[PDB]
Design a protein around this motif. Structure first.
Motif, PDB file in Angstrom:
ATOM      1  N   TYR A   8       0.542  -1.277  -0.305  1.00  0.00           N
ATOM      2  CA  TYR A   8       0.476  -0.201   0.383  1.00  0.00           C
ATOM      3  C   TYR A   8       1.385   0.835  -0.030  1.00  0.00           C
ATOM      4  O   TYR A   8       2.372   1.436   0.499  1.00  0.00           O
ATOM      5  CB  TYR A   8      -0.894   0.112   1.314  1.00  0.00           C
ATOM      6  N   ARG A   9       0.422   2.349  -0.719  1.00  0.00           N
ATOM      7  CA  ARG A   9       1.671   3.486  -1.232  1.00  0.00           C
ATOM      8  C   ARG A   9       1.793   4.231   0.800  1.00  0.00           C
ATOM      9  O   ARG A   9       2.719   4.898   1.195  1.00  0.00           O
ATOM     10  CB  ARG A   9       0.521   5.065  -1.041  1.00  0.00           C
ATOM     11  N   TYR A  13       4.412  -3.859   2.629  1.00  0.00           N
ATOM     12  CA  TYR A  13       5.617  -5.110   3.557  1.00  0.00           C
ATOM     13  C   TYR A  13       5.060  -6.404   3.138  1.00  0.00           C
ATOM     14  O   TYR A  13       3.652  -6.556   2.566  1.00  0.00           O
ATOM     15  CB  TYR A  13       5.773  -5.229   4.549  1.00  0.00           C
ATOM     16  N   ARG A  14       6.000  -7.528   2.787  1.00  0.00           N
ATOM     17  CA  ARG A  14       5.047  -8.975   2.835  1.00  0.00           C
ATOM     18  C   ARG A  14       5.795 -10.172   4.101  1.00  0.00           C
ATOM     19  O   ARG A  14       6.795  -9.430   4.539  1.00  0.00           O
ATOM     20  CB  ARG A  14       6.156  -9.924   1.624  1.00  0.00           C
TER      21      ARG A  14
END
Length: 17
Positions: A8-9, A13-14
């Motif tokens: 998202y802006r 992250y993952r």
């Protein structure tokens, strides 16, 4: 084992551990 990836802006992250 919970894998959730999101970008998202405001937050990019993952998660996969």
């Amino acid at each position: 084992k919970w894998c959730f990836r999101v970008c998202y802006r405001g937050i990019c992250y993952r998660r996969c551990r």
